[PDB]
């Protein structure tokens, strides 16, 4: 059971203090936008705690930043779930509500009366990029085309019935997961600029990365029951059962390595981090910004496992939304 699994990272430092004013915030957003409705949708997505989700996730953040994590996961949980149907088994409908999305990353605002996923989204990356450094808005402009444009693949793998490769996995698992989508969003509601000589680093590439896989593996662990009954295939647990031909208790411990062996590295390398900023002559300001970066990646890893331990999606979903139906209440999104 996932009560029964510990992935060894620490606690979360810090909360942010702004947890019950962006609840406050992000049900009017959510309302007021058409994402959620009244009802069975509302309490559904109250359930969740996209609120503790922001304020565990994203610690650093204050006001109107953390507001902005909020409706910015409330948009990809809930357009996550508009795939849990009809759409995660069309690729080719799939492709083409993406590219909606895609289409507004790239400057075709929604215009008015745009459907509540598109406005959601539209309002999302209007906050993101207003007063954000041009090297993070054309980073993160193509972070979210790769979001958008994984979910056919998983729609395709879906259909084909068989776990991918590892290789492939992570291909469509990052892309699926919003690649390093949090991390773009944690630096910009800590308002710093992660240098970019610091940025690309070996060091800051690989403990990135290393990040962004621990939570989507720590996701596939805890989410798998309300995935497996819906026929997806792109869940760590469920690659290396297929991959190995061991039992499923073989395959979750095995997944639990590979969560372990990735903080193992991320903490390595962090012990690194002071000395490259030397070697690379960075000014203390630009210390300062690395180092929050640093609690920003440390504090993604441990506040997502904190959330997600606490919300009632994972063990809530199987009972109120069984896989012989689809997975929502409402539908959102036009296809
Ligand atoms: C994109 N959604 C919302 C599905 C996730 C965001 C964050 C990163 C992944 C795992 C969970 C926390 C869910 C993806
Ligand atoms: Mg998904
Ligand atoms: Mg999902
Ligand atoms: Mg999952």
Redesign the pocket.
Known sequence: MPQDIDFGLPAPAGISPGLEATRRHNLGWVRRLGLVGDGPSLAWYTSWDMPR?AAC?FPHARGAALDLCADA?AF??VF?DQFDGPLGRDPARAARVCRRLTGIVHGAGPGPGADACSAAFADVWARSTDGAHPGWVARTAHEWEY?FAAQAHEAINRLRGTPGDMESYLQVRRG???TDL?LSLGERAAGITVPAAAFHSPQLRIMREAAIDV??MC?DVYSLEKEEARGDMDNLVLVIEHARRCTRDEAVTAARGEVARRVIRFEQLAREVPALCAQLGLSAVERAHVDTYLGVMEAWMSG?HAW?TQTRRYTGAPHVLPSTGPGYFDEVLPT
């Open positions: 989700l996730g996961m990809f949980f996550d979001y699926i997961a919003g949090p939570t989507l996701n997502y997600q």
